[PDB]
RNA sequence: CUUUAAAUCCUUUAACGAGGAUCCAUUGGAGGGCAAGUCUGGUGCCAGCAGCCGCGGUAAUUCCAGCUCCAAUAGCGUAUAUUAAAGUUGCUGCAGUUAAAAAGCUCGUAGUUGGAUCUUGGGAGCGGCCG
């Protein structure tokens, strides 16, 4: 009898076919285009997309104008819109089945940071994110898997406590300046 | 087939047997499209128009194509009713 | 260098008095010249060999071995075909299989799953096909499901154009020839299945011969 | 299914249970004699003591004499055999040593050209055999 | 500093702290199943590899070593118990002439399953035959 959590849940499923050519090709292409550390992240994205798809199918397989169906569909569609995948003109339940994994990855913090025009390369964006360099709406962000929302899109830039956004320099510039000053005297 | 608007997505409509009301597939070479010409009542002459029939391969293979053609021609008004 | 047709259908398709092969399928005209498909279906036709089984027969002169090739060709828009050819040399066997697969292609039709919105994406019904001791059935799937099957039938279906489908096989799937023929027979009956959508009476368009006899009587003697 | 009556469930269940019981894998997994005859007794591993080293021949046209160990168990005193997997690892095993024995992996079935051997050696003298092969560790002396 | 019964842990901030950034990432494989060498050197039905087929007989792509290579990558291999694959336990949904399998035949108590036929139309109306 201890006050604990006991709640755990996986987030990925390993493909049943171990050695496939097309599957590896698509996974490698996605990792290369969007800068992923390993196949676990594309697997977790596939798992959550499959969960969303099966939930949509379960909601769709019932009759029209069912209050539970309408409530759950409206909630899920609003969640998808505020995440930033669907548009304002596509608010129908059957449009859920026509989503792509690239649509989910393009809302990643890493790729959005790379795209908005403050990092040279996507790997550069990821390494900038991981080393705590920029913030999201007056809050410092650290993890590139941050699912960026819709309203929280125009208020992300460099941080105040960063050498790039205006602040005290880092660890190498001060050391080089000290070395130069010591050499000068 | 239909859609939101109402247009057709089937790239071709297949044929259909005039006797057994069964459609004709693409790789069904036994199907026959028969043309029967009518005769003007005034004197008896060829005019230029015709009547088209279609029989699936199964009917001919089983051997009831001639009876079906006879029935179709009788119904259309070619074969005499008393016969 | 220009293609010389043999039958009068070749004359019609070469002289450009025909517009498409859809009515060729509609009238169920057999195809004997493999270049008609090339004329109609251009660079969008892709072929891929499946497997090579060296068949070996024994005689008084010792064992005799030759190769039989399986290949599937078809554009990714609704036309799919299979070809089988056996020859002494493997390369000539591949060419013959390609020619035979090009000669025999059956168009397929696709439907929707409940919500009839957009372009067709799945098999309209629960088609079936059996040859030898292999039975393959195709079940419609919602959008984005994919092609869940063995690699060879998945390749064949995605070559045909049916992106969403469910499959179920029974028997000796190890024999690639019988399994491929069964999954081709199952996909070749998607049109030959009377659906209440097609209950309308069909108007009999005149046969191409009956309309172009005035040209075929003077082209070839 | 043959009997399809709306009130025929007991007969169907009895026939199904009989046909399931008279099977092979279900019968093996649901009878006490199979586990009683198992040298381990349903355990994944079991320690033993070496009695003498023995060599065995081949079965298919694969002539190569292979060396095993005649090991006597500890829990029940059963005397079994054990194959030494890797190359030239028989020298690492001396007489009367603590050896951990595990099955080969085919569920108590002879494998390959080695007749009558269903086990293998994984640990000797509380030291892993893989470490003794790669030289990462060393057998105490 | 802060937290805390007092402390450790997390966060915050000073002062240091990286170029082969030696502040150096392993586990099983490279014949097919199953993604990856007719590479090089060594023993030659021996030593061994091998879940299966099989690889070794003086040119071994399969054994022993080096380079290269593929898979997951703070993780990977092995034994066991078990689930889907098993439409090889089949209620959905398996088979019984020749591959495993219809009692030698009939009667028969339980159990199971049982033919047809008993109810119908109009009145008024919301409305463009029928909502």
UniProtKB/Swiss-Prot annotation, chain A:
Q: Which UniProt keywords apply?
A: Acetylation, Cytoplasm, Isopeptide bond, Nucleus, Phosphoprotein, Ribonucleoprotein, Ribosomal protein, RNA-binding, rRNA-binding, Ubl conjugation
Q: Which InterPro entries match?
A: Ribosomal_uS4, Ribosomal_uS4_CS, Ribosomal_uS4_euk/arc, Ribosomal_uS4_N, S4_RNA-bd, S4_RNA-bd_sf
For molecular function, the Gene Ontology terms on record are:
rRNA binding; structural constituent of ribosome
**A Gene Ontology CC term for this entry?**
cytosolic ribosome
Q: Which GO terms describe its biological process?
A: ribosomal small subunit biogenesis; translation
**Location of the Glycyl lysine isopeptide (Lys-Gly) (interchain with G-Cter in SUMO2) covalent cross-link?**
92, 138
Q: Where in the cell is it found?
A: Cytoplasm; Nucleus, Nucleolus
Residues forming the S4 RNA-binding domain are 107-181
Indicate where the modification Phosphoserine is found in the sequence.
152, 162
* Record flagged with keyword Cell cycle: no
Q: Where is this region: Disordered?
A: 161-185
Q: Which residues carry this modification: N6-acetyllysine?
A: 65, 115, 154
Task: List, alphabetically, the Gene3D superfamilies matched.
Answer: RNA-binding S4 domain (3.10.290.10)
Pfam families registered for this protein in UniProt: Ribosomal_S4, S4
The lineage's top-level taxon is Eukaryota
Q: How does it assemble?
A: Component of the small ribosomal subunit. Identified in a IGF2BP1-dependent mRNP granule complex containing untranslated mRNAs. Part of the small subunit (SSU) processome, composed of more than 70 proteins and the RNA chaperone small nucleolar RNA (snoRNA) U3.
Q: Which family does it belong to?
A: Belongs to the universal ribosomal protein uS4 family.
Q: What does this protein do?
A: Component of the small ribosomal subunit. The ribosome is a large ribonucleoprotein complex responsible for the synthesis of proteins in the cell. Part of the small subunit (SSU) processome, first precursor of the small eukaryotic ribosomal subunit. During the assembly of the SSU processome in the nucleolus, many ribosome biogenesis factors, an RNA chaperone and ribosomal proteins associate with the nascent pre-rRNA and work in concert to generate RNA folding, modifications, rearrangements and cleavage as well as targeted degradation of pre-ribosomal RNA by the RNA exosome.
Q: Provide the protein name.
A: Small ribosomal subunit protein uS4
Q: Which gene encodes it?
A: RPS9
UniProtKB/Swiss-Prot annotation, chain B:
The protein's name is Small ribosomal subunit protein eS21
Give the record's family classification: Belongs to the eukaryotic ribosomal protein eS21 family.
What Pfam families does the record point to? Ribosomal_S21e (PF01249)
Q: Which organism does this record belong to? A: Oryctolagus cuniculus
Q: Which InterPro entries match?
A: Ribosomal_eS21, Ribosomal_eS21_CS, Ribosomal_eS21_sf
Q: How does it assemble?
A: Component of the 40S small ribosomal subunit.
Any Gene Ontology CC annotation: cytosolic ribosome
* Keyword terms of this UniProt record: Acetylation, Cytoplasm, Endoplasmic reticulum, Isopeptide bond, Ribonucleoprotein, Ribosomal protein, Ubl conjugation
Which positions carry N-acetylmethionine? 1
GO MF entries: structural constituent of ribosome
Biological process GO terms, please? translation
Localization in the cell: Cytoplasm, Cytosol; Cytoplasm; Rough endoplasmic reticulum
The record's section on PROSITE patterns has: RIBOSOMAL_S21E
The cross-link Glycyl lysine isopeptide (Lys-Gly) (interchain with G-Cter in SUMO2) sits at: 41
Say what the protein does.
Answer: Component of the small ribosomal subunit. The ribosome is a large ribonucleoprotein complex responsible for the synthesis of proteins in the cell.
Swiss-Prot record, chain D:
Post-translational modifications: Hydroxylation at Pro-61 affects translation termination efficiency.
User: Where primarily located?
Assistant: cytoplasm
| Biological process according to GO | translation
Identify the keywords attached in UniProt to this record, alphabetized.
Answer: Acetylation, Cytoplasm, Endoplasmic reticulum, Hydroxylation, Isopeptide bond, Nucleus, Ribonucleoprotein, Ribosomal protein, Ubl conjugation
Sequence ranges of Basic residues compositional bias: 1-19
Give the subcellular location. Cytoplasm, Cytosol; Cytoplasm; Rough endoplasmic reticulum; Nucleus, Nucleolus
Instruction: Give the sites modified to 3-hydroxyproline.
Output: 61
User: What top-level branch of life does the organism fall under?
Assistant: Eukaryota
Residues of the region (Disordered) are: 1-25
An annotated Gene Ontology molecular function: structural constituent of ribosome
Q: Which CDD domains match?
A: Ribosomal_S23
Task: Tell me one Pfam family matched here.
Answer: Ribosom_S12_S23
Q: Which residues carry this modification: N6-succinyllysine?
A: 53
Q: Give the family, as the similarity comment puts it.
A: Belongs to the universal ribosomal protein uS12 family.
Give the NCBIfam families listed for this entry. PRK04211.1 (NF003254), uS12_E_A (TIGR00982)
Q: How does it assemble?
A: Component of the 40S small ribosomal subunit. Part of the small subunit (SSU) processome, composed of more than 70 proteins and the RNA chaperone small nucleolar RNA (snoRNA) U3.
Please give the function described in this protein's UniProt entry: Component of the ribosome, a large ribonucleoprotein complex responsible for the synthesis of proteins in the cell. The small ribosomal subunit (SSU) binds messenger RNAs (mRNAs) and translates the encoded message by selecting cognate aminoacyl-transfer RNA (tRNA) molecules. The large subunit (LSU) contains the ribosomal catalytic site termed the peptidyl transferase center (PTC), which catalyzes the formation of peptide bonds, thereby polymerizing the amino acids delivered by tRNAs into a polypeptide chain.
Q: What is this protein called?
A: Small ribosomal subunit protein uS12
Q: What taxonomic ancestry is recorded?
A: Eukaryota, Metazoa, Chordata, Craniata, Vertebrata
């Amino acid at each position: 009898p201890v006050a604990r959590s006991w709640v755990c849940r996986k987030t990925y499923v390993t493909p049943r076919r171990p050695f496939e050519k097309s599957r590896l090709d698509q996974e490698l292409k996605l990792i290369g285009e969007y800068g992923l550390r390993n196949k676990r992240e594309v697997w977790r994205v596939k798992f959550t997309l499959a969960k969303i798809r099966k939930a949509a199918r379960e909601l769709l397989t019932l009759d029209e104008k069912d209050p539970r169906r309408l409530f759950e569909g409206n909630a899920l569609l609003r969640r998808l819109v505020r995440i930033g995948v669907l548009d304002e003109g596509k608010m129908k339940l059957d449009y859920i089945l026509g989503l792509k994994i690239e649509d989910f990855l393009e809302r990643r913090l890493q790729t959005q940071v790379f795209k908005l025009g403050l990092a040279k390369s996507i790997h550069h964006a990821r390494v900038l994110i991981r080393q705590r360099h920029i913030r999201v709406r007056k809050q410092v962000v650290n993890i590139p898997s941050f699912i960026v929302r819709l309203d929280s899109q125009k208020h992300i830039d460099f941080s105040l406590r960063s050498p790039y956004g205006g602040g005290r320099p880092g660890r190498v510039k001060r050391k080089n300046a000290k070395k130069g000053q010591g050499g000068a005297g | 087939m239909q859609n939101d608007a109402g247009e057709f997505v089937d790239l071709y409509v297949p044929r259909k047997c005039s006797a057994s009301n069964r459609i004709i597939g693409a790789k069904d070479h036994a199907s026959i499209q028969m043309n029967v010409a009518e005769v003007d009542k005034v004197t008896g002459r060829f005019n230029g128009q015709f009547k088209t029939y279609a029989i699936c391969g199964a009917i001919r293979r089983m051997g009831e194509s001639d009876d079906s053609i006879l029935r179709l021609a009788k119904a259309d008004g070619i074969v005499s009713k008393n016969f | 260098k220009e293609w010389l047709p043999v039958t009068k259908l070749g004359r019609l398709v070469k002289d450009m008095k025909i517009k498409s092969l859809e009515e060729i399928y509609l009238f169920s005209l057999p195809i004997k010249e493999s270049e008609i498909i090339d004329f109609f279906l251009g660079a969008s036709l892709k072929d891929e060999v499946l497997k090579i089984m060296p068949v070996q027969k024994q005689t008084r002169a010792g064992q005799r071995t030759r190769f039989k090739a399986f290949v599937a060709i078809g554009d990714y828009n609704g036309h799919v075909g299979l070809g089988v050819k056996c020859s002494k040399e493997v390369a000539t066997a591949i060419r013959g299989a390609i020619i035979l697969a090009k000669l025999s292609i059956v168009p397929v039709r696709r439907g929707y799953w409940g919500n009839k919105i957009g372009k067709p994406h799945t098999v309209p019904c629960k088609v079936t096909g059996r040859c030898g001791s292999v039975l393959v059935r195709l079940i419609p799937a919602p959008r984005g499901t994919g092609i869940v099957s063995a690699p060879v039938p998945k390749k064949l279906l995605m070559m045909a154009g049916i992106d969403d489908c469910y499959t179920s096989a029974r028997g000796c799937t190890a024999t690639l020839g019988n399994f491929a023929k069964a999954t081709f027979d199952a996909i070749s009956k998607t049109y030959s299945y009377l659906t209440p959508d097609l209950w309308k009476e069909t108007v009999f368009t005149k046969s191409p011969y009956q309309e172009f006899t005035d040209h075929l009587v003077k082209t070839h003697t | 299914g043959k009997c399809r009556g709306l009130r025929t469930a007991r007969k169907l269940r009895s026939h199904r249970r009989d046909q399931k019981w008279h099977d092979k894998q279900y019968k093996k997994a649901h009878l006490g004699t199979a586990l009683k005859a198992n040298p381990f007794g349903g355990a994944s591993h079991a320690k033993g003591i070496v009695l003498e080293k023995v060599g065995v021949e081949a079965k298919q046209p694969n002539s190569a004499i292979r060396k095993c160990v005649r090991v006597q168990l500890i829990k029940n005193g059963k005397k079994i055999t054990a194959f030494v997997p890797n190359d030239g690892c028989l020298n690492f095993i001396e007489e009367n040593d603590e050896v951990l024995v595990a099955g080969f992996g085919r569920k108590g079935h002879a494998v390959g050209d080695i007749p009558g051997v269903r086990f293998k050696v994984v640990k000797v003298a509380n030291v892993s055999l893989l470490a003794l092969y790669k030289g990462k560790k060393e057998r105490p002396r």
